[PDB]
Amino acid sequence: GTSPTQIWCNNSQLPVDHILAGSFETAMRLLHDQVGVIQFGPYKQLFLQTYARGRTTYQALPCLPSMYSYPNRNWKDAGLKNGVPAVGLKLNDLIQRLQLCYQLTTVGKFEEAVEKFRSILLSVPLLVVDNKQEIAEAQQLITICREYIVGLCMEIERKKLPKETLDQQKRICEMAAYFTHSNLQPVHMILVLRTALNLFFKLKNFKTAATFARRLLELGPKPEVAQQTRKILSACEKNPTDACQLNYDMHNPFDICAASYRPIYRGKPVEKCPLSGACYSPEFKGQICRVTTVTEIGKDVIGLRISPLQFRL
Amino acid sequence: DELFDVKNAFYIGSYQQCINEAQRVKLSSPEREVERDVFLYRAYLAQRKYGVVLDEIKPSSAPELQAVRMFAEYLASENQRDSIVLELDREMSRSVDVTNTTFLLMAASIYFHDQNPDAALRTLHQGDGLECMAMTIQILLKLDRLDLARKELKKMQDQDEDATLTQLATAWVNLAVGGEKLQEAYYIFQELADKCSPTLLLLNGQAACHSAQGRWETAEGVLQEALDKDSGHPETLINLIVLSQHLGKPPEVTNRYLSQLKDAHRAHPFIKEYQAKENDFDRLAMQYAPSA
């Protein structure tokens, strides 16, 4: 007859369903078309893990091979024909993990934070989502992950680059400033602003520093920080002026190149990761996304398909 | 039936109980004595004490025992298997004897492992016994032809509704059916455990029923109890891995059970499949991966 796993495959477009089924090739294809995922290698743990949960086992008779049971999320209604695998991974689970990521960011554990963030980001396509808004949250969740990943990754590099040349220093300040734009939560956003302010201050680009200081204050950082910020801000006011011109436009909209960590203003051509939304300069197109690590930058895709609602007829 | 307790203990899954009782029972008949020995060894096979069966059953033993021993060697020696099947094929073709039911069951069992469902089913077709019917249904379920399975079940159902063997069979069909049926399967497993005794087999069956339905949490107790009795029990560990993920246990937990399974039985087909999946995944990765 037809195996239950096969039934699941026939029944659902969702990639997780196929993984549960054990149909890797099918699942990979779906991930490849719907999302960009060219490089499956980072996926392997997720697949096996997901795969393991798919079916239960019980023994009909002794000394014979054990039987397998396939749980269905719609067990009641599903007949033999319309079964679909039980869930097992949910949006809330992913959201919960996010806090741990936040914690690591605050501590300065950025490298570890990236891993947790990326782990969640990759996991999003696995989900089966019940309602339309819930789908939006998933997309939003992914966005948050890339934002941190690119931002944190940019930060790690900035620290690495050499301080010695003036040009080198200008580069650092620029990158620090770029971080400012990243959409993080206020606790983190404040932290980055704090950093940028100092770099700009030493740079003697006081005018720009003043703007950062004001933005920081609005956030409402702890009192000690706020006081310090006010102190710096007043100093900046004495000589509001930027000594050097930097390749940074606070006002102009940006898009940080995930690879280059260079600004891409407004309209200027950009290539984006189908999955993450990470942005890259056109040169990168066709390459593996640094943020996602699985995806192809240039790839055009159907789009994430977490819920059956997405399919319409 | 004098043997009733011994056999019943066997089907439920409490092998040791079967063995103990088998010894206590008195022969009272050359026929019965043979049946008793058959179950006694069958129990040892369940236990995986192959050596016991191979050593004790000797050529002089009754043909029924010989069949059991045949199965034992098949399980025990991987190398021997092709040779055994070949001989089995020869014996099956070159010899009519239907009467030996034990032979049919053992032979069918070998075919089943051989993954020659047709042959096993073919053999079972000849056998009249109630057990033969139960085995037949099980094979049909694996075949995923529930419909055929249902027919056999009723067939046995007419003969003996109350028999535990029949009840187990119904539960199986039941579990396959899905839906409201699942609850029915759950009760039968529960009732058996209550009456006879919770066996690892029975506990997992109950767990499977609960898991089929959403009730992951309810499943926890049965698996937990089963695990306590026997770590390394294949069905239990597998169920635990599945259960753990639904519960939201830490990923390490799922991994731990999986590793534990490997320790208990490196060979276990679940493990092999897992490995197989890993292999093709790597294979697939190369397919998608960019060239360099």
Residue numbers in the entry:
A (entry chain A): 913 to 1225
B (entry chain E): 17 to 308
Provide the publication's sentences verbatim:
Coat protein 1 (COPI) coated vesicles function in retrograde trafficking between the Golgi apparatus and the Endoplasmic Reticulum (ER), and between the Golgi cisternae in both retrograde and anterograde directions. Coatomer (the COPI complex) is a heteroheptameric protein complex, consisting of α, β, β’, γ, δ, ε and ζ subunits. Arf1-GTP recruits the protein complex coatomer from the cytoplasm and anchors it at the membrane. Polymerization of coatomer at the membrane assembles the COPI coat, which recruits cargo molecules and membrane machinery to the assembly site.
The linkage structures are at lower resolution than that of the leaf, so we fitted our leaf structure as a rigid body to assess which subunits are close to one another in the linkages. Consistent with our previously published structures the central contacts in linkages I and IV are made by the αε-COP subunits, and those in linkage II are made by the δ-COP MHD. Interestingly neither ε-COP nor the δ-COP MHD are essential for COPI function and the combined deletion of both is not lethal for yeast. While the contacts formed by these proteins at the linkages may play a regulatory role, they are therefore not essential for COPI function. The slightly improved resolution of the linkage structures obtained here compared to our previously published maps showed that the density that we interpret as being contributed by a flexible hydrophobic loop of the N-terminal β-propeller of α-COP, is in the vicinity of γ-COP in a neighbouring triad. We found that βArf1 is close to the N-terminal β-propeller of β’-COP in a neighbouring triad, and approaches the trunk domain of β-COP. While the low-resolution of the linkage structures precludes more detailed interpretation, the proximity of the peripheral βArf1 molecule to neighbouring triads suggests that βArf1 could modulate inter-triad interactions.
